[PDB]
């Protein structure tokens, strides 16, 4: 019964080191079950992230039409499995960026349920 909205917070929100992703991918349970190959963390307030659902409507990478792109670039961290990464000893490279985020939005209230892209 983890809601769709709560799953997005768990997977993608860090409103608050080159070791960041090793730390965070385990801390949010993205290394339980598998090494999730790619993950993005957004370092903005939840309110700023939820407000993107009110921003520029754009197609999601898979062709869905309920995605929204932020007007400003936002503070993010990319996490990406390393070559020596093999389950259950996952390992990640951290790359910081400032990019527009794209999310898919659902529900009432209308909030992000999928992190789609950064550009």
């Amino acid at each position: 019964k983890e809601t769709a909205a709560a799953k997005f917070e768990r997977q993608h929100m860090d409103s608050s080191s080159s070791n960041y992703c090793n730390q965070m991918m385990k801390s949010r349970n993205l290394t339980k079950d598998r090494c999730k190959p790619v993950n993005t963390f957004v370092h903005e307030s939840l309110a700023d992230v939820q407000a993107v659902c009110s921003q520029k409507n754009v197609a999601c990478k898979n062709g869905q039409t309920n995605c929204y792109q932020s007007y400003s670039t936002m503070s993010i961290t990319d996490c990406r499995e390393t070559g020596s990464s093999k389950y259950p000893n996952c390992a990640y490279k951290t790359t910081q960026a400032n990019k527009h985020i794209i999310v898919a939005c659902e529900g009432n209230p209308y909030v992000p349920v999928h992190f789609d892209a950064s550009v």
Partner: nanobody
Amino acid sequence: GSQVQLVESGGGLVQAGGSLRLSCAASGYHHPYIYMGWFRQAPGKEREGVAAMDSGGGGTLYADSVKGRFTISRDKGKNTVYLQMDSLKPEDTATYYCAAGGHHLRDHTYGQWGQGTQVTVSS
């Protein structure tokens, strides 16, 4: 000004077998809504998508029960969407809602909703 509004017009009371048009024009949103559509909630029933269409006038979708009777259209380069409803049946009686910014006829994916317009088809 500051707020998005989906202004719904048209609808109302008609005899079974009659025709009505619903209209929806969005203001305050400064980009295309890729999909807009009409949903309804009839007495005793859950909300359901009725028709939807994309911003280029394609990707048209209808609920099975209204195909051939209802016609959705959009103004190109504007966020307006219309529903011509012919051959109306009593079970088309419902609150109709404009919806914008979602995906196809999936209601949970739409984030902007009109207040709802009654359509009442008598018998």
